[PDB]
Design a protein around this nucleic acid. Structure first.
Length: 304
RNA sequence: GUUAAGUCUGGUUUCCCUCCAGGGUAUCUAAGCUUUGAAAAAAA
């Protein structure tokens, strides 16, 4: 039902190329969680060139990711190039604060992203530099000096997701998994948890990157205010497929932690023919289009 | 009255240091060197 991913050690979720150190994301993308879960549930017989088909077959609908620090729940929130983790008690008045007056707008939002921001109390950015040594000289092998900015945790942190199917939630319990990038470790634990679904509010929080079908890109973009009140829109890669050893895709997405307006739902519902409808239904199945209500902890997918 | 004979004794006691000063002043580190040379982007 509810799955807590507890990182045993600093993590690495590489983003935006490798070219001082390569930076890590705060919240891992849903493709990473889906890939770890499929890695657990894998069987070496269902192979197909469609990574997400073989991945949707291995599991069920996964709901987006947030932070459980110590009983508290933190949620991503971005204003544009400004990520933060806030407890939902500060998301309540947010829509009121959105089309509130100007100076009150900046007062409130910059009090949220700076003092109410619980990111740095939780997250440290730990640069790690490694090298490679040739086994006969015992001096650094030439050209092998790499760096990466890992995501260290000051206090114990969990990533929270919700999975619908309860059959896999038995062979997922207590598994030690290779969560993330350069061979780091996290533990999964499964617990029964109660979460509402599909509330009809006006302002939702993108818990996961809301994908855009690359057909309504111009449509969605040239009038952007109609769908997102605050957040970031960026072209993101969908990761790396283990089977064929390639990058996955690139799609414009509404980065997790954005504030979406109810209209976006109907918009996405009107711009998908059967083909890409099935495609993006799969995408949502593995966990991309997850919304939460600023009211309370109540999730819903956009299409499903 | 006369005689005759001298004998004993030959430095003792006390005090043997007391009081003040028991180190003072100056110097309390100085000038250098504060990283250098190899490895910056590698094959699948």
């Amino acid at each position: 039902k509810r799955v807590l991913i507890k990182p045993l050690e600093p993590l690495m979720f590489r983003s935006q190329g490798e070219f001082t150190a390569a930076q890590s994301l705060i919240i891992p993308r849903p493709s990473t969680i889906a890939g770890m879960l499929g890695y657990i549930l894998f069987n070496k017989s269902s192979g197909t060139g469609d990574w997400l088909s073989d991945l949707t077959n291995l599991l069920a609908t996964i709901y987006g990711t947030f932070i459980e620090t110590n009983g508290e729940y933190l949620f991503p929130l971005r204003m544009g190039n400004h990520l933060a983790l806030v407890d939902q008690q500060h998301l309540i008045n947010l829509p009121t604060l959105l089309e509130k007056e100007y100076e009150r707008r900046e007062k409130g939002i910059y009090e949220l992203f700076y003092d109410k921001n619980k990111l740095f109390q939780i997250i440290n950015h730990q640069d790690r530099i490694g090298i490679s040594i040739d086994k006969s000289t015992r001096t650094v092998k030439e050209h092998y000096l790499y760096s990466a900015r890992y995501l260290a945790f000051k206090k114990e942190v969990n990533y929270v997701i919700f999975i619908d199917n309860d059959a896999i939630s038995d062979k997922i319990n207590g598994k030690i998994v290779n969560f993330g990038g350069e061979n780091r470790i996290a533990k999964l634990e499964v617990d029964d948890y109660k979460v509402d679904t599909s509330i009809e509010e006006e302002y939702y929080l993108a818990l996961s990157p809301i994908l855009i079908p690359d057909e309504a890109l111009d449509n969605f973009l040239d009038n952007i205010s109609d769908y997102v009140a605050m957040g970031k829109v960026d072209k993101i890669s969908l990761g790396f497929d283990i089977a064929n050893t390639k990058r996955k895709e690139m799609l414009t997405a509404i980065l997790e932690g954005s504030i979406v307006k109810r209209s976006i739902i109907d918009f996405i519902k009107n711009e998908i023919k059967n083909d890409l409808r099935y495609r993006f239904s799969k995408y949502e199945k593995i966990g991309y289009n997850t919304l939460m209500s600023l009211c309370k902890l109540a999730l819903r997918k956009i299409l499903s």
